């Protein structure tokens, strides 16, 4: 017996189907008229209204196109595929639901940003090839690990003020190395050279075009370069999504905060961006060197991993400095670039990624995801797996529960993992209609000019009307 289907009222095939999917509509004379056409499926099957006269839809979730997720990101063999199925068709009912699976794989390489500060004081002239080789292989070996890389350039000597720079002869003021009968450039401070760009050749070949300066005191002002490379996002060109690495080169000790007192520079560092239109650090001679705590704060605030590339004679000093900068590392600036490329690889190996799902074009009538994450955690409720790595897979599940029937038949909605070049859409389609009355026969003379709705073979008469064609009146119908 129908607990719902018939007890909520029966008026037409469309209204009959407006009830939950548990109900169907019969339109044949194969059984007596003891109950409306909306008897429940258990009654429909046994009473067995004619098979050709049953209006019983079933939701269909079918793949429209499903190109499998690629296991390689190489362009020589694939265009990569990150979400599947790309499009699934959905036949729907105004109160039905059906399972709809979806899958994600991280295939495209992680974006990286490696910026390279240069020590160009006269101290470095003895091993300039070391720093140049390091700058070259930073690019060349990272192109061998990731295809989404951007590299930049910068230099530092020291604040162009006494007692750091030779102001004494006019010759020295434009060629400090005069006193040694040799030529070298005037002192910079800190000056940005090449903005972050993907052109390896330009950076690789333009590294070789830099040369040394000279200052007096052994400590060099590299910390100002650190602070300005970190905080000047526009000039540097840091990219929001990419992993940021900063490689800092130096051969000697470092000017730490409060060392600027000797030069009359008693203004604390503030971390603002001061690189000018000429790409020089304007406040180089106005602002003291930065504090390790301030450097750590600004280095974490902008997600930078700093790697010290220093020579064998200062490794211990900078290691001990490293522990005061939590998260920093350090390597030898030997003639061969080893032990700093290792730190770069190790940094790449720890940048895990997130897979969040966002939806657009989704109408109000249609579910929240249950996320199955790595290590086969099948957790309901959660819809955003974290800690993923390239080559891994995460699976999501959703069912298209319906809240009603919309204005028209055809709609769609698009799902997209955040930050992915791939996405999928469903051409969701709702079958609220019925084929019985589409024949235009209703309200004809065969239904007594509209005294009943045509069931595609028999007229369903309204109150006060009776007969297959509504040719009789209930008030006049009497025993005879």
């Amino acid at each position: 017996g129908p607990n719902i289907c018939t007890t909520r009222g029966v008026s037409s095939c469309q209204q009959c189907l407006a009830v939950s999917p548990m109900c169907a509509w019969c339109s044949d004379e194969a059984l007596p008229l003891g109950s409306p056409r909306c008897d429940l499926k258990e009654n429909l099957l046994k009473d067995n209204c004619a098979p050709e006269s049953i209006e019983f839809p079933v939701s269909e979730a079918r793949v429209l196109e499903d190109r499998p997720l690629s296991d390689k990101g190489s362009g020589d063999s694939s265009q990569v595929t990150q979400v599947s199925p790309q499009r699934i068709a959905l036949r729907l009912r105004p109160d039905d639901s059906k399972n709809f699976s979806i899958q994600v794989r991280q295939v495209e390489d992680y974006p990286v940003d490696i910026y390279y500060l240069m020590d160009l004081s006269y101290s470095m002239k003895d091993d300039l090839w070391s720093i140049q080789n390091l700058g070259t292989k930073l690019a060349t070996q990272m192109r061998k690990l990731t295809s989404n890389l951007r590299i930049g350039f910068g230099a530092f000597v020291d604040k162009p003020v006494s007692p750091y720079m030779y102001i004494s002869p006019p010759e020295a003021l434009e060629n400090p190395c005069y006193d040694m009968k040799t030529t070298c450039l005037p002192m910079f401070g800190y000056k940005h050279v090449l903005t972050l760009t993907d052109q390896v050749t330009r950076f690789n070949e333009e590294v070789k075009k830099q040369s040394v300066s000279r200052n007096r005191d052994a400590p060099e002002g590299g910390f100002d370069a650190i602070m300005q490379a970190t905080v000047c996002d526009e000039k540097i060109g840091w990219r929001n999504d990419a992993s940021h690495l900063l490689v800092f080169t130096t051969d000697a000790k470092t000017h730490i905060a409060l060392d600027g007192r000797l030069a009359g520079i008693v203004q604390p560092n503030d971390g603002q961006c001061h690189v000018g239109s000429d790409n020089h650090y304007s406040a180089s001679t106005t602002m003291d060197y930065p504090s390790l705590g301030l450097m750590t704060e600004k280095l974490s605030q902008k997600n930078i991993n700093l790697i010290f590339a220093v020579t064998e004679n200062v490794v211990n000093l900078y290691q001990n400095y490293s522990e005061l900068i939590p998260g920093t590392t350090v390597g030898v600036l030997s003639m061969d670039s080893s032990n700093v490329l290792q730190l770069i690889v190790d940094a790449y190996g720890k940048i895990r990624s997130k897979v969040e799902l966002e939806v657009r074009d989704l109408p109000e009538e249609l579910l929240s995801f249950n996320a199955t994450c790595l290590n086969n955690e099948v957790i309901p409720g959660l819809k955003s797996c974290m800690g993923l790595k390239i080559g891994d897979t995460v699976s999501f599940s959703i069912e298209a529960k319906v809240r009603g029937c919309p204005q028209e038949k055809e709609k769609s909605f698009t799902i997209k993992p955040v930050g992915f070049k791939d996405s999928l859409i469903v051409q969701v389609t709702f079958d609220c209609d019925c084929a019985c009355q589409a024949q235009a026969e209703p309200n004809s003379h065969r239904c007594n000019n509209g005294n009943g709705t045509f069931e595609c073979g028999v007229c369903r008469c309204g109150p006060g009307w009776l007969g297959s064609q509504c040719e009789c009146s209930e008030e006049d119908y009497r025993p005879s």
Partner: protein, 921 residues
């Protein structure tokens, strides 16, 4: 509490001149006027051809707060050869370091540049100008024939500066010997003596200086900061210098002998790049004869609350203990990026009642990063590692941080208070501030009541006006004041209270006799140097007669000083010592009866009994209650008997029980009766009172549970046994039935009556006979249903006796006859007894409903006297009594498990028939 943080003097210099970068006090031995010295290393000067060659200003105290330049020199550069100057005095930072002692002023320009006589050059050797009276001279120990950076070139001499005892300057050049830094010390007399303006490499014979160390010591900045104190015992000020970059930037502080510049002791920091040594100070902060060294590490990073590091800074205090041994504590900062430890300014005796004190500054902390300073006082055990006061900046950055507290100087009394004042530099705003120290008044207090532990009120004191005799206890309180500084001999004060517990809303208790109030206050003058001055007071004790108010009573007071009237003529105001409390109290207690123990165990008993032990609920029953109680412990102090009552006086009628006052209420739905035994109830004085409650209608309910428990003043739960009464739920069920007849007797023959063939009217048969039966309840119990029956004589000797016509009913009952009523359908000679036992019986059977006190059910029956049975020949002259009877009993009660009772009552009524007109004899 010590330093005046209100109305401190402010000094301003030219904009962007860094006025206040270095500060000091000027103390002329020639005259009594005191001057401040403030350095403005970036001020533009009237020198010819010099751009911001620096300045030093003598800021007065006080006519108009003016700051006047000191004309150390009035000349620009000088020529070595034409178009070949030897000297470059622009941007030289004159005033970067200022220091004074008696009539001598020594200021230096660390960034003065000169051209070496051996080559064309510009080297910042640094130069100092020393004034001693009007005899100004130039002291430039680093300007020499040691020319290059390898020597005293770039010496930056005068970066750090200090004198000693006697007269011998200490000078620190951080740049000498490839920035190893160095110290140079000379006699002021020798500096003045060997000056001629035409020599550029002047040499001093009694000079002590450090020398080139191994290259591994380069960039140590020895002499970044310097201080002097005796640490070897010879009584000559030894040299202490901060080396902020030493030992892989950990930071070291060196100590050098003050007579031959030999190395005594070395200190090391513990955190790299903390700049351990940015500021140093030598002071003895524990009263000993031995001087302790302080060291600043403004960039110190320590693990915070969340486990992460944070630049807070710190100060390390190393006490000197008579053997050359040093025991070191540490003092961390309180804010991030405040650089706590930037400046360390010894004050000494700031806590006049104590040992030397020290101030420590964090110039980039505080609100809006305007700078803050911490004051720490020293104790015999060492330094009070918790700050004692807070000073912070009061201006906005323009555009660089105000840097309030970047440089300070204390240990001098400008306004002759007797204890050091403090000068603060705020060069970021081009301002420096002077903080005056306040005079400490120390007050010791005490109040006593020797009649403490009053036992009996002893009412003898005359209550004002009414002259009533009342109780009392003597109360007195005294104070004594002293102070080491210059503060008036007319200290002024203004209170004392009679209770501390009662401050929460409660009953009044005692009062001050003449004051009539629970608290009082009255001013007095102390004079600042006398013995305790005071007088006693007279307290009107209360109460136990109207307020039942014997927990202890507390006496408490505090002293109200006023700083306004005691303000110093210079505008300052005195202060009270920090750790002397304003609260002081003595309470003891008051005793009446119980024994010498803190509990005074209230072992007692209570019992109850019921007059009627079966309830009989049918009305406002006379129910009465009997109670008793006794004391076996030390006594009950608040022996209140509480009794709970059901949903439901008089007992004073007689002296049968030991009656005493009670009361009733239903506060917060807790229906209760309150009866008092005593306050206290006297020991061994058992009592028994009695009680009465008396309508109830609840069905199947017996929740009456009168109970007892006694209150007291004991500190523990003192829960007495809860004894309760008992009554059983039962009711009496008396019921009875009664009736009456009309007429009672009849005389035959009936008037104008004659025999009938068949009767159809009432008068055809005979006169009417009517009976009435009445059933009523008597006992409290009410039954649910009941039955009653009537017995009627119908026929005897085959003749009718009484002929019933109909019956009527009143009340909740119904009836039906066992034989047809009015079967013939009539239109509506001694006495002999007849009835159902002789005559043929007729019965009326009836049911009844619920009856109750005063409720009734009545049955009426109408009948006719059958005249034929007594007028016929064989029955003439006869007499008969045609009586009838009724009976009833209960069949159901509204309860089943409760006791039940039945009834057996019955009643009969008379009706006599007699012959009146008898034949004559």
């Amino acid at each position: 509490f010590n330093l005046d943080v209100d109305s401190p003097a402010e000094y301003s210099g030219p904009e962007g001149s860094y006025f206040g970068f270095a500060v000091d006090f000027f103390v002329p031995s020639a005259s009594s006027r005191m001057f401040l010295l403030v350095g403005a290393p970036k001020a533009n000067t009237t020198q010819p051809g010099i751009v911001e060659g620096g300045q030093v200003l003598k800021c007065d105290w006080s006519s108009t707060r003016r700051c006047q330049p000191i004309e150390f020199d009035a000349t620009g550069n000088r020529d070595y050869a034409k178009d070949d100057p030897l000297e470059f005095k622009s941007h030289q930072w004159f005033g970067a370091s200022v220091r004074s002692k008696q009539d001598k002023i020594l200021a230096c320009a660390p960034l003065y540049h000169w051209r070496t006589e051996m080559k064309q050059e510009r080297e910042p050797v640094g130069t100092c100008f020393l004034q001693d009276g009007t005899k100004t001279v130039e002291y430039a120990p680093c300007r020499s024939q040691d020319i290059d950076a390898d020597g005293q070139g770039f010496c930056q001499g005068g970066f750090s500066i200090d004198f000693t005892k006697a007269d011998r300057v200490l000078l620190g050049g951080p740049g000498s010997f490839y920035w190893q830094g160095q110290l140079i010390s000379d006699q002021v007399a020798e500096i003045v003596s060997k000056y001629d303006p035409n020599v550029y490499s002047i040499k001093y014979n009694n000079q002590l200086a450090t020398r080139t160390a191994q290259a591994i010591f380069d960039d140590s900045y020895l002499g970044y900061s310097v201080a002097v104190g005796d640490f070897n015992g010879d009584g000559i000020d030894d040299f202490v210098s901060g080396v902020p970059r030493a030992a892989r930037t950990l930071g070291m502080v060196y100590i050098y002998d003050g007579k031959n510049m030999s190395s005594l002791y070395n200190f090391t920091g513990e955190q790299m790049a903390a700049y351990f040594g940015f500021s140093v100070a030598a002071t003895d902060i524990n009263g000993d004869d031995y001087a302790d060294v302080f060291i600043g590490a403004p960039l110190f990073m320590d693990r915070g609350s969340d486990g992460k590091l944070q630049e807070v800074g710190q100060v390390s205090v190393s006490l000197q203990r008579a053997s050359g041994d040093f025991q070191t504590t540490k003092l961390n900062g309180f804010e991030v990026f405040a650089r706590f430890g930037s400046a360390i300014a010894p004050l000494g005796d700031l806590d006049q009642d104590g040992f030397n004190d020290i101030a420590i500054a964090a110039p980039y902390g505080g609100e809006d990063k305007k700078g803050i300073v911490y004051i720490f006082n020293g104790r015999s055990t060492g330094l009070n590692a918790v700050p004692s006061q807070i000073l912070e900046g009061q201006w906005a950055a323009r555009s660089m941080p105000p840097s309030f507290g970047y440089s300070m100087k204390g240990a001098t009394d400008i306004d002759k208070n007797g204890y050091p004042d403090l000068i603060v530099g705020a060069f970021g705003v081009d301002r420096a501030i002077l903080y005056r120290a306040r005079p400490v008044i120390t007050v010791n207090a005490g109040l006593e009541v020797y009649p403490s532990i009053l036992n009996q009120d002893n009412k003898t004191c005359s209550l004002p006006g009414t002259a009533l005799k009342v109780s009392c206890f003597n109360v007195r309180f005294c104070l004594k004041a002293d102070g080491k500084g210059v503060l008036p001999r007319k200290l002024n004060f203004q209170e004392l209270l009679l209770d501390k517990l009662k401050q929460k809303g409660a009953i009044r208790r005692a009062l001050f006799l003449y004051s009539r109030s629970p608290s009082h206050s009255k001013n007095m003058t102390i004079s600042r140097g006398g013995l305790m001055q005071c007088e006693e007071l007279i307290a009107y004790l209360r109460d136990e007669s109207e307020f039942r108010d014997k927990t202890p009573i507390t006496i408490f007071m505090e002293y109200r000083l006023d700083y306004r009237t005691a303000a110093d003529t210079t505008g300052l105001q005195p202060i009270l010592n920090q750790f002397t409390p304003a609260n002081i109290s003595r309470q003891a207690h008051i005793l009446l009866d119980c024994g010498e123990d803190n509990v005074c165990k209230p072992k007692l008993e209570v019992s109850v009994d019921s007059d009627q032990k079966k309830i009989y609920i049918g009305d406002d029953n006379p129910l009465t209650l009997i109670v008793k109680a006794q004391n076996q412990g030390e006594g009950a102090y608040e022996a209140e008997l509480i009794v709970s009552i059901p949903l439901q006086g008089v007992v004073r009628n007689n002296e049968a029980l030991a009656r005493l006052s009670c009361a009733f209420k239903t506060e917060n739905q807790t229906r209760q009766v309150v009866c008092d035994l005593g306050n206290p109830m006297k020991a061994g004085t058992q009592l028994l009172a009695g009680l009465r409650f008396s309508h109830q209608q609840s069905e199947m309910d017996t929740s009456v549970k009168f109970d007892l428990q006694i209150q007291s003043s004991n500190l523990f739960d003192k829960v007495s046994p809860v004894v309760s009464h008992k009554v059983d739920l039962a009711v009496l069920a008396a019921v009875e039935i009664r009736g009456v007849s009309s007429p009672d007797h009849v005389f035959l023959p009936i008037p104008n009556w004659e025999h009938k063939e068949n009767p159809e009217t009432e008068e055809d048969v005979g006169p009417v006979v009517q009976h009435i039966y009445e059933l009523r309840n008597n006992g409290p119990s009410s039954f649910s249903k009941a039955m009653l029956h009537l017995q009627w004589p119908y026929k005897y000797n085959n003749n009718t006796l009484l002929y019933i016509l109909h019956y009527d009913i009143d009340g909740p009952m119904n009836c039906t006859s066992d034989m047809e009523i009015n079967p013939l359908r009539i239109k509506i000679g001694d006495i002999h007894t007849l009835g159902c036992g002789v005559a043929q019986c007729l019965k009326i059977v009836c049911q009844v409903g619920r009856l109750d006190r005063g409720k009734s059910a009545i049955l009426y029956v109408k009948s006719l006297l059958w005249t034929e049975t007594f007028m016929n020949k064989e029955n003439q002259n006869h007499s008969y009594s045609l009586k009838s009877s009724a009976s009833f009993n209960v069949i159901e009660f509204p309860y089943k498990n409760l006791p039940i009772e039945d009834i057996t009552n019955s009643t009969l009524v008379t009706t006599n028939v007699t012959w009146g007109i008898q034949p004559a004899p």
